[PDB]
Amino acid sequence: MINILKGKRGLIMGVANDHSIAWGIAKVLHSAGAQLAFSYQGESIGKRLKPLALTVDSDFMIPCNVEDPSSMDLLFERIKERWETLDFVVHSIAFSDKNELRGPYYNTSRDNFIQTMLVSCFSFTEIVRRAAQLMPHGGAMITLTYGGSMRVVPNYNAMAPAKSALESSTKYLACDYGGMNIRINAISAGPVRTLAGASISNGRDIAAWSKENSPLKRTVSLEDIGNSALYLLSYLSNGVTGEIHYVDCGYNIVAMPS
Amino acid sequence: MINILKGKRGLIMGVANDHSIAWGIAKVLHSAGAQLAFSYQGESIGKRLKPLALTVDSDFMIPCNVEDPSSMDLLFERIKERWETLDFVVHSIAFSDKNELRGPYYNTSRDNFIQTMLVSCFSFTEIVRRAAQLMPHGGAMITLTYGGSMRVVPNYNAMAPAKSALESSTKYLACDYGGMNIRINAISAGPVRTLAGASISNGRDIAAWSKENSPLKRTVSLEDIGNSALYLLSYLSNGVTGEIHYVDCGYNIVAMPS
C-alpha cells in the first residue's frame, strides 16, 4: 500500500521497549520499505531491542550514550562499517531525573538542568551534525517534542526548557542544512497511553486529561506518530522544514473544557 | 512626574556599562521612585558601576557570579542585610562565546552550549527562586529575551536555544509563584543601535535591517525598554504574567519587506 521508503535506510534512536515512540516509528518506517539501524542506551534495553529489531529485518544495533560525544562518534563509525550513506534519522530521546518531575519547576537542580539539556536537547544537534555528513544527496531528520515546552504542564519541569531549546535548535538546524537539501522537523506528540504513566509521576493524569479534552477524544497512538514520521521523512513532505508539527489529536487547539 | 514606584525597592542584574539594557532600565525605574541594588560581575565592571549607581542615588552594589550558586546565596544574604523584602527584580544577563556567534549553528560547542545555558537561562531560575523568599506579599520580576529564540536570526546560534529555554522557564516560574502574587514576565527587545554591533558579529546589520523593516522605522531605545520594564514591574501590569512582551517597534509582525 505504501512503499515510499523502498531503498532507503536510516537510524532510529530512543527505543527502550515495545511501547517507545521510537519503536512505533521504526515499525512504520520499515513497513514502508526502510532498512533500519538502532542505537541503544544500555544492555537491559539492548536485550529487549534484539527480538524487536529482528521483526523489522534488522540486526544492526549499536550501543550509544548520547551524553558522551565520543560515544556518538563511535556510533557513526559503526554505522559506516555497513553504510556509506543514510537517508533519515529519528531522534526520540527524552531524559530527565524523574524524581525532579514532581512539584514546582523552581526546585529543578542545576545538575539535572544540565544533564537534561545535554540529553534531551543538545544530543539532537550532536546527532544531526554527524548524520548530515552521511547525506551527500540530502535527506530528512526528525526529533520529538511536546507542547509542554511553551505551555505549562504540571510536573513537566526541567523537560520544558529542554524541549523549548530543542524546538529552537530544530529551526536553526533546518536553516543550516536546507542548502544541502536536508530537511529537519519535529513531531510534537501528545501523551501516549501507558507510556505516559511510566514516564512521569502524573503521566496517567496527563494522558487522561488529554484524551477527555482533545477534539478527537483519544490519545495519539504509537502508530499515528509513526505515520506522521513517515510523512516527515519521505518525499511527501518535500515542502516542509523547520516545522513543529502537532500530532496530539488536536489537544493543543482547545482553550478550556467544553 | 511619574512616581508609581515610590517606596519600592528592587534588584538590577546585568549592568556592565552605561549602554547596558539593565542600565537603561535602572534609570527609568529610579526616575519612577525606586531604590535600587545592583549586582556586578568582576572588578572592572564594579569600577564602572560605582559612578553610574551614584547617579541613581545608590551605593548598594554586590558582587555576583551567576554561574556560582554560593555566590548567588551570598548576593541575597547581602541584600537581606539592608532589606527585609524586595519589590522587583530585573534580570538582564546574557552571555555566549562570541567566537561561536558566527557561522552555522551546528558548529556550536558542547561547552559553549552549556555555559550559555547556565548564564543566559538557568541563572534566571536561580535568581527568581532566591528573590521569591523576599516577596512575602508578592512582587514582580522580568527577564530579557529576543525574537531570535524561535525565528532564525543569522549567527545568533547558541543564544537561540538559551533564550527559548529562558522564555519557557519564565512561564513555568510564573505558574510556580502566581499563587503568591509574584508576576514573572519577559521583554523581548529589538536590537538597540550600537549595543547590537558590540554584542554580536553582524549586529550592525541586524539592527539596520530591523530598523528599515519595522513598522515604526526606528530601533528600540534603552529608554523604551526601561519604560516597558516600568510597566511590567509596577501595579500597571497587575493583570499580566507569563507574558513574552515584544518591545521591538513591531518588527516581529512583518512577514517580508515592503
Coordinates of C-alpha atoms in Angstrom, one line a residue:
Chain A
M1 CA 0.0 0.0 0.0
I2 CA 2.8 2.4 0.8
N3 CA 6.5 1.7 -0.1
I4 CA 7.8 5.2 -0.3
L5 CA 11.0 4.4 1.6
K6 CA 11.9 1.5 -0.6
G7 CA 15.7 1.5 -1.0
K8 CA 16.1 3.9 1.9
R9 CA 18.0 3.4 5.2
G10 CA 18.1 5.2 8.4
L11 CA 19.0 5.4 12.1
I12 CA 16.4 5.0 14.9
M13 CA 17.4 6.5 18.3
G14 CA 15.4 6.1 21.5
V15 CA 14.0 2.6 21.6
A16 CA 13.7 1.4 25.2
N17 CA 10.9 -1.1 24.9
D18 CA 8.0 -2.0 22.6
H19 CA 6.0 1.0 23.9
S20 CA 8.7 3.5 23.0
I21 CA 7.8 6.2 20.5
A22 CA 10.9 5.3 18.6
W23 CA 9.7 1.8 18.2
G24 CA 6.3 2.7 16.9
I25 CA 8.1 4.9 14.4
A26 CA 10.5 2.1 13.4
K27 CA 7.7 -0.3 12.7
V28 CA 6.0 2.1 10.4
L29 CA 9.2 3.1 8.5
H30 CA 10.2 -0.5 8.0
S31 CA 6.7 -1.3 6.7
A32 CA 7.2 1.4 4.1
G33 CA 10.5 -0.1 2.9
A34 CA 13.2 1.3 5.0
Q35 CA 16.3 -0.6 6.4
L36 CA 17.0 0.3 10.0
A37 CA 19.9 0.7 12.3
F38 CA 19.2 1.2 16.1
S39 CA 21.2 2.9 18.9
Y40 CA 20.6 1.5 22.4
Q41 CA 21.3 3.2 25.7
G42 CA 22.1 0.1 27.8
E43 CA 22.2 -3.7 27.9
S44 CA 18.8 -4.2 29.5
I45 CA 17.3 -2.2 26.7
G46 CA 19.6 -4.0 24.1
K47 CA 18.2 -7.3 25.2
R48 CA 14.6 -6.1 24.5
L49 CA 15.7 -4.5 21.3
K50 CA 17.2 -7.6 19.7
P51 CA 14.0 -9.5 19.1
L52 CA 12.2 -6.3 18.2
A53 CA 14.8 -5.4 15.6
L54 CA 14.5 -8.9 14.1
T55 CA 10.8 -8.3 13.4
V56 CA 11.9 -5.4 11.2
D57 CA 14.6 -7.4 9.5
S58 CA 17.5 -5.7 11.4
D59 CA 20.4 -7.0 13.5
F60 CA 22.1 -3.6 13.3
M61 CA 22.2 -2.4 16.9
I62 CA 24.9 -0.1 18.3
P63 CA 25.4 0.9 22.0
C64 CA 25.5 4.7 22.5
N65 CA 25.4 7.1 25.4
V66 CA 24.1 10.4 23.9
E67 CA 25.6 12.3 26.8
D68 CA 29.1 11.4 25.6
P69 CA 30.4 13.0 22.3
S70 CA 33.0 10.2 21.9
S71 CA 30.2 7.6 22.2
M72 CA 28.3 9.3 19.4
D73 CA 31.5 9.5 17.3
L74 CA 31.8 5.7 17.8
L75 CA 28.1 5.2 16.9
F76 CA 28.7 6.8 13.5
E77 CA 32.0 4.9 12.9
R78 CA 29.9 1.7 13.5
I79 CA 27.2 2.8 11.1
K80 CA 29.8 3.5 8.4
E81 CA 31.1 -0.1 8.7
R82 CA 28.0 -1.1 6.8
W83 CA 26.5 2.0 5.3
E84 CA 28.3 4.8 3.3
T85 CA 25.2 7.0 3.5
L86 CA 22.0 7.5 5.5
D87 CA 18.6 8.8 4.3
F88 CA 17.0 9.7 7.6
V89 CA 17.5 9.9 11.3
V90 CA 14.8 9.6 14.1
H91 CA 15.8 11.2 17.4
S92 CA 13.3 10.3 20.1
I93 CA 15.3 10.8 23.3
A94 CA 13.7 12.3 26.4
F95 CA 15.5 12.2 29.7
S96 CA 15.4 14.0 33.0
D97 CA 15.6 12.9 36.6
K98 CA 12.0 11.7 37.1
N99 CA 12.3 12.4 40.8
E100 CA 12.5 16.1 39.9
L101 CA 9.5 15.9 37.5
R102 CA 7.3 16.4 40.6
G103 CA 6.3 19.5 42.5
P104 CA 7.2 23.1 41.4
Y105 CA 9.6 23.8 38.5
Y106 CA 11.7 26.0 40.7
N107 CA 13.1 23.0 42.6
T108 CA 14.8 21.9 39.4
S109 CA 18.5 21.3 40.3
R110 CA 21.4 22.8 38.4
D111 CA 22.8 19.4 37.8
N112 CA 19.6 17.9 36.5
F113 CA 19.1 21.0 34.3
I114 CA 22.5 20.5 32.7
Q115 CA 22.0 16.8 32.2
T116 CA 18.5 17.2 30.8
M117 CA 19.7 19.9 28.5
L118 CA 22.6 17.8 27.2
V119 CA 20.5 14.6 26.6
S120 CA 17.1 15.9 25.7
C121 CA 18.3 18.9 23.7
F122 CA 21.9 19.1 22.7
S123 CA 22.1 15.4 21.6
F124 CA 19.9 16.3 18.6
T125 CA 22.5 18.9 17.5
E126 CA 25.3 16.4 18.0
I127 CA 23.5 13.6 16.2
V128 CA 22.3 15.9 13.3
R129 CA 25.8 17.3 12.6
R130 CA 27.3 13.8 12.5
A131 CA 24.5 12.3 10.3
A132 CA 24.5 15.2 7.8
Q133 CA 28.0 14.0 6.8
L134 CA 26.4 10.8 5.5
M135 CA 23.8 12.7 3.4
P136 CA 25.7 13.9 0.3
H137 CA 22.4 14.0 -1.7
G138 CA 20.2 15.3 1.0
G139 CA 17.8 13.5 3.4
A140 CA 15.5 14.2 6.3
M141 CA 15.6 14.0 10.1
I142 CA 13.1 14.4 12.9
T143 CA 13.1 14.9 16.6
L144 CA 10.3 14.5 19.2
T145 CA 8.9 17.3 21.4
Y146 CA 5.8 18.0 23.5
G147 CA 3.7 21.1 23.8
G148 CA 4.7 21.4 27.5
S149 CA 7.7 23.3 26.0
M150 CA 5.8 26.5 25.8
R151 CA 2.6 26.0 27.7
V152 CA 2.8 24.9 31.3
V153 CA 2.2 21.3 32.2
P154 CA 2.3 20.4 35.8
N155 CA 5.4 18.5 36.9
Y156 CA 7.0 18.7 33.4
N157 CA 9.6 21.0 34.9
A158 CA 13.1 20.5 33.6
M159 CA 11.8 18.9 30.4
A160 CA 10.1 22.1 29.4
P161 CA 13.1 24.4 28.8
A162 CA 14.9 21.4 27.3
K163 CA 12.1 20.8 24.7
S164 CA 11.8 24.5 24.0
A165 CA 15.5 24.7 23.3
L166 CA 15.2 21.6 21.2
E167 CA 12.4 23.2 19.1
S168 CA 14.6 26.3 18.7
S169 CA 17.6 24.2 17.6
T170 CA 15.4 22.3 15.1
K171 CA 14.7 25.6 13.3
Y172 CA 18.3 26.7 13.4
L173 CA 19.5 23.3 12.1
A174 CA 16.8 23.4 9.3
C175 CA 18.4 26.7 8.2
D176 CA 22.0 25.4 8.5
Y177 CA 21.3 22.4 6.3
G178 CA 18.5 23.4 4.0
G179 CA 21.0 24.4 1.3
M180 CA 22.1 20.7 1.3
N181 CA 18.5 19.6 0.9
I182 CA 18.4 18.1 4.3
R183 CA 15.1 18.8 6.0
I184 CA 14.8 18.9 9.8
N185 CA 11.4 18.8 11.5
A186 CA 9.9 17.9 14.9
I187 CA 6.9 16.0 15.9
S188 CA 5.1 17.5 18.9
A189 CA 3.5 14.3 20.2
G190 CA 0.6 14.2 22.6
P191 CA 0.8 11.8 25.5
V192 CA 0.7 8.1 24.6
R193 CA -1.3 6.0 27.0
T194 CA 0.6 3.5 29.2
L195 CA 3.9 5.2 28.1
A196 CA 2.8 8.4 29.8
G197 CA 2.2 6.8 33.2
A198 CA 5.6 5.2 33.1
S199 CA 7.4 8.4 32.1
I200 CA 6.4 10.9 34.7
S201 CA 4.6 10.9 38.1
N202 CA 1.4 12.4 36.9
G203 CA 1.6 10.9 33.4
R204 CA -1.6 8.9 33.8
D205 CA -3.5 12.0 34.7
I206 CA -1.9 14.0 31.8
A207 CA -3.0 11.3 29.3
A208 CA -6.5 11.0 30.8
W209 CA -6.9 14.8 30.7
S210 CA -5.6 14.9 27.1
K211 CA -8.0 12.1 26.0
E212 CA -11.0 13.7 27.7
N213 CA -10.4 17.1 26.3
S214 CA -8.9 16.6 22.8
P215 CA -11.2 17.2 19.8
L216 CA -10.9 13.5 18.8
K217 CA -11.5 12.1 22.3
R218 CA -8.5 9.8 22.1
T219 CA -4.8 9.9 22.8
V220 CA -2.3 9.6 19.9
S221 CA -1.1 6.1 19.2
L222 CA 2.4 4.9 18.5
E223 CA 1.2 4.1 15.0
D224 CA -0.1 7.6 14.5
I225 CA 3.3 9.1 15.4
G226 CA 5.0 6.5 13.2
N227 CA 2.8 7.5 10.2
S228 CA 3.5 11.2 10.8
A229 CA 7.2 10.4 10.9
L230 CA 6.8 8.5 7.6
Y231 CA 5.4 11.7 6.2
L232 CA 8.1 13.9 7.5
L233 CA 10.9 11.6 6.5
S234 CA 9.7 10.9 2.9
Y235 CA 9.3 12.9 -0.3
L236 CA 5.6 13.6 0.7
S237 CA 6.9 16.4 2.9
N238 CA 9.3 17.9 0.4
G239 CA 7.8 21.3 1.0
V240 CA 8.2 21.1 4.8
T241 CA 11.2 22.1 7.0
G242 CA 11.7 23.6 10.5
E243 CA 8.2 22.6 11.3
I244 CA 6.9 21.9 14.9
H245 CA 4.1 19.6 13.8
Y246 CA 1.4 18.7 16.3
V247 CA 0.4 15.0 16.4
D248 CA -1.6 15.3 19.5
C249 CA -5.2 14.6 18.3
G250 CA -5.8 18.3 18.3
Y251 CA -5.3 18.8 22.1
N252 CA -3.3 22.0 21.7
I253 CA -6.1 23.9 20.0
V254 CA -8.6 23.6 22.9
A255 CA -8.8 26.6 25.2
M256 CA -10.8 25.0 28.0
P257 CA -13.1 22.0 28.6
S258 CA -16.4 22.0 26.7
Chain B
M1 CA 6.3 63.5 37.5
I2 CA 5.7 59.7 37.3
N3 CA 6.1 58.2 40.8
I4 CA 4.5 54.8 40.7
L5 CA 7.5 53.0 42.2
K6 CA 7.6 55.4 45.2
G7 CA 8.8 53.4 48.3
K8 CA 9.7 50.4 46.2
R9 CA 13.0 48.5 46.3
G10 CA 14.5 46.3 43.6
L11 CA 17.5 44.4 42.3
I12 CA 19.1 45.2 39.0
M13 CA 21.3 42.5 37.4
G14 CA 23.3 42.8 34.2
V15 CA 24.8 46.3 34.3
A16 CA 28.2 46.2 32.5
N17 CA 28.4 49.9 31.4
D18 CA 26.1 52.8 30.6
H19 CA 24.9 51.3 27.4
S20 CA 23.7 48.1 29.1
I21 CA 19.9 47.3 28.8
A22 CA 19.9 46.8 32.6
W23 CA 21.2 50.3 33.0
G24 CA 18.6 51.9 30.7
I25 CA 16.1 50.1 32.8
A26 CA 17.6 51.2 36.1
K27 CA 17.4 54.8 35.0
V28 CA 13.8 54.6 34.2
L29 CA 12.8 52.7 37.4
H30 CA 14.7 55.1 39.6
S31 CA 13.0 58.1 37.9
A32 CA 9.7 56.5 38.9
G33 CA 10.8 56.3 42.5
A34 CA 12.6 53.0 43.0
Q35 CA 15.5 52.4 45.3
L36 CA 18.0 50.1 43.6
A37 CA 20.6 47.5 44.4
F38 CA 22.9 46.3 41.7
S39 CA 24.8 43.1 41.2
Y40 CA 28.2 43.2 39.4
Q41 CA 30.4 40.6 37.7
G42 CA 34.1 41.4 38.2
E43 CA 36.1 44.4 39.4
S44 CA 36.3 46.5 36.1
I45 CA 32.5 46.4 35.8
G46 CA 32.4 47.3 39.5
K47 CA 34.5 50.3 38.9
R48 CA 32.3 51.4 36.0
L49 CA 29.1 50.7 38.1
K50 CA 30.0 52.9 41.1
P51 CA 29.6 56.3 39.4
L52 CA 26.6 55.1 37.5
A53 CA 24.8 53.8 40.6
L54 CA 25.6 57.1 42.4
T55 CA 23.6 59.0 39.7
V56 CA 20.5 56.9 40.7
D57 CA 21.3 57.5 44.4
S58 CA 22.6 54.0 45.1
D59 CA 25.8 52.7 46.6
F60 CA 24.2 49.2 47.1
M61 CA 26.5 47.2 44.8
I62 CA 27.1 43.5 45.4
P63 CA 29.4 41.2 43.5
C64 CA 27.9 38.1 42.0
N65 CA 28.9 35.3 39.6
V66 CA 25.7 33.8 38.3
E67 CA 27.5 30.6 37.5
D68 CA 28.2 30.1 41.2
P69 CA 25.3 29.1 43.4
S70 CA 27.3 30.0 46.5
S71 CA 27.8 33.5 45.1
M72 CA 24.1 33.9 44.4
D73 CA 23.4 32.8 48.0
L74 CA 25.8 35.5 49.2
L75 CA 24.2 38.1 47.0
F76 CA 20.9 37.5 48.7
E77 CA 22.4 37.5 52.2
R78 CA 23.9 40.9 51.4
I79 CA 20.5 42.2 50.2
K80 CA 18.9 40.9 53.5
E81 CA 21.4 43.0 55.4
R82 CA 19.6 46.2 54.3
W83 CA 16.2 45.0 53.1
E84 CA 13.7 42.5 54.6
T85 CA 11.9 42.4 51.2
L86 CA 12.3 43.3 47.5
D87 CA 9.5 44.6 45.3
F88 CA 11.1 43.7 41.9
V89 CA 14.0 42.0 40.1
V90 CA 15.4 42.9 36.7
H91 CA 17.4 40.0 35.1
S92 CA 19.3 41.2 32.1
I93 CA 22.1 38.7 31.9
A94 CA 23.2 37.1 28.6
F95 CA 26.5 35.5 27.6
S96 CA 27.8 33.2 24.9
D97 CA 31.2 32.7 23.3
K98 CA 31.4 35.5 20.7
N99 CA 33.6 33.2 18.6
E100 CA 30.7 30.9 18.1
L101 CA 28.1 33.6 17.3
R102 CA 29.0 33.4 13.7
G103 CA 28.9 30.7 11.1
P104 CA 26.4 27.8 11.3
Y105 CA 24.6 27.0 14.5
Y106 CA 25.7 23.3 14.1
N107 CA 29.3 24.3 15.0
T108 CA 28.2 25.3 18.5
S109 CA 30.5 23.5 21.0
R110 CA 29.1 21.5 23.9
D111 CA 31.0 23.7 26.5
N112 CA 29.6 26.9 25.0
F113 CA 26.1 25.4 24.8
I114 CA 26.3 24.5 28.5
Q115 CA 27.8 27.9 29.7
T116 CA 25.4 29.8 27.5
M117 CA 22.5 27.8 29.0
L118 CA 23.7 28.3 32.6
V119 CA 24.3 32.0 32.3
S120 CA 21.6 33.1 29.9
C121 CA 18.8 30.8 31.0
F122 CA 19.3 29.0 34.3
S123 CA 20.6 32.0 36.2
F124 CA 17.0 33.4 36.0
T125 CA 15.7 30.3 37.8
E126 CA 18.4 30.6 40.4
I127 CA 17.7 34.3 40.9
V128 CA 13.9 34.0 40.9
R129 CA 13.8 31.3 43.5
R130 CA 16.1 33.2 45.8
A131 CA 14.2 36.5 45.3
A132 CA 10.8 35.0 45.9
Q133 CA 11.9 34.5 49.5
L134 CA 12.0 38.3 49.8
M135 CA 8.5 38.7 48.4
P136 CA 6.1 37.6 51.1
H137 CA 3.3 39.8 49.8
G138 CA 4.0 39.4 46.1
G139 CA 6.1 41.3 43.6
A140 CA 7.2 41.3 40.0
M141 CA 10.2 40.2 38.0
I142 CA 11.4 40.4 34.4
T143 CA 14.0 38.9 32.2
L144 CA 15.2 40.0 28.8
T145 CA 14.8 37.9 25.6
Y146 CA 14.9 38.3 21.8
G147 CA 12.8 37.0 19.0
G148 CA 15.8 35.0 17.7
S149 CA 14.7 32.4 20.2
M150 CA 12.1 31.0 17.8
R151 CA 12.7 32.6 14.5
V152 CA 16.1 32.2 12.9
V153 CA 18.5 35.1 13.1
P154 CA 21.9 34.5 11.4
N155 CA 24.7 34.0 13.8
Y156 CA 22.6 34.1 16.9
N157 CA 23.4 30.4 17.3
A158 CA 23.7 29.1 20.9
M159 CA 21.8 32.1 22.2
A160 CA 18.7 31.0 20.4
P161 CA 18.0 27.8 22.4
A162 CA 19.1 29.5 25.6
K163 CA 16.6 32.3 25.1
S164 CA 13.9 29.8 24.1
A165 CA 14.6 27.9 27.3
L166 CA 14.5 31.2 29.2
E167 CA 11.1 32.0 27.8
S168 CA 9.8 28.6 28.7
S169 CA 11.2 28.9 32.2
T170 CA 9.5 32.3 32.5
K171 CA 6.1 30.7 32.1
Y172 CA 6.8 27.8 34.4
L173 CA 8.1 30.2 37.1
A174 CA 5.0 32.4 36.6
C175 CA 2.9 29.3 37.4
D176 CA 5.0 28.3 40.4
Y177 CA 4.8 31.7 42.0
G178 CA 1.5 33.1 40.9
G179 CA -0.3 31.8 44.0
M180 CA 2.0 34.2 45.9
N181 CA 1.1 37.1 43.7
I182 CA 4.5 37.2 42.2
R183 CA 4.3 38.1 38.5
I184 CA 7.1 36.9 36.1
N185 CA 7.4 38.3 32.5
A186 CA 9.9 38.8 29.8
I187 CA 10.7 41.7 27.5
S188 CA 11.6 40.5 24.0
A189 CA 13.6 43.5 22.9
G190 CA 14.6 44.5 19.4
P191 CA 18.2 45.3 18.7
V192 CA 19.4 48.5 20.2
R193 CA 21.6 50.7 17.9
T194 CA 25.3 50.5 18.8
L195 CA 24.8 47.9 21.6
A196 CA 23.9 45.5 18.8
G197 CA 27.2 45.7 16.9
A198 CA 29.1 45.4 20.2
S199 CA 27.1 42.3 21.1
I200 CA 27.4 40.0 18.0
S201 CA 29.4 39.8 14.8
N202 CA 26.7 41.1 12.4
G203 CA 25.0 43.2 15.0
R204 CA 25.1 46.4 12.9
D205 CA 23.4 44.6 10.0
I206 CA 20.7 43.1 12.3
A207 CA 20.0 46.5 13.8
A208 CA 19.9 48.2 10.4
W209 CA 17.6 45.6 8.9
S210 CA 15.3 45.7 11.8
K211 CA 15.2 49.5 11.7
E212 CA 14.5 49.6 8.0
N213 CA 11.8 47.0 8.1
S214 CA 10.0 47.7 11.4
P215 CA 6.5 49.4 11.1
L216 CA 7.8 52.4 13.0
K217 CA 11.1 52.7 11.0
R218 CA 13.2 53.0 14.2
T219 CA 15.1 50.8 16.6
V220 CA 14.0 50.5 20.2
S221 CA 15.9 52.7 22.7
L222 CA 17.2 51.9 26.1
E223 CA 14.5 54.3 27.4
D224 CA 11.7 52.4 25.5
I225 CA 12.9 49.2 27.2
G226 CA 13.0 50.9 30.5
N227 CA 9.5 52.3 30.2
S228 CA 8.2 48.8 29.3
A229 CA 10.1 47.4 32.3
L230 CA 8.4 50.1 34.4
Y231 CA 5.0 48.9 33.1
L232 CA 5.8 45.2 33.8
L233 CA 7.2 45.8 37.3
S234 CA 4.6 48.2 38.6
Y235 CA 0.9 48.0 39.5
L236 CA 0.0 48.9 35.9
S237 CA 0.6 45.3 34.8
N238 CA -1.3 43.7 37.7
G239 CA -3.2 41.6 35.1
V240 CA -0.1 40.3 33.3
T241 CA 2.1 37.3 34.0
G242 CA 4.0 34.7 31.9
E243 CA 4.0 37.2 29.0
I244 CA 6.7 37.4 26.4
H245 CA 6.1 41.1 25.5
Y246 CA 7.6 42.4 22.3
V247 CA 9.3 45.8 22.6
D248 CA 10.8 45.7 19.1
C249 CA 8.9 48.6 17.4
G250 CA 6.7 45.9 15.8
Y251 CA 9.5 44.2 13.8
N252 CA 8.1 40.8 14.7
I253 CA 4.8 41.3 12.9
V254 CA 6.4 41.9 9.4
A255 CA 6.4 39.0 7.0
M256 CA 8.6 40.5 4.4
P257 CA 9.9 43.9 3.3
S258 CA 7.7 46.5 1.5

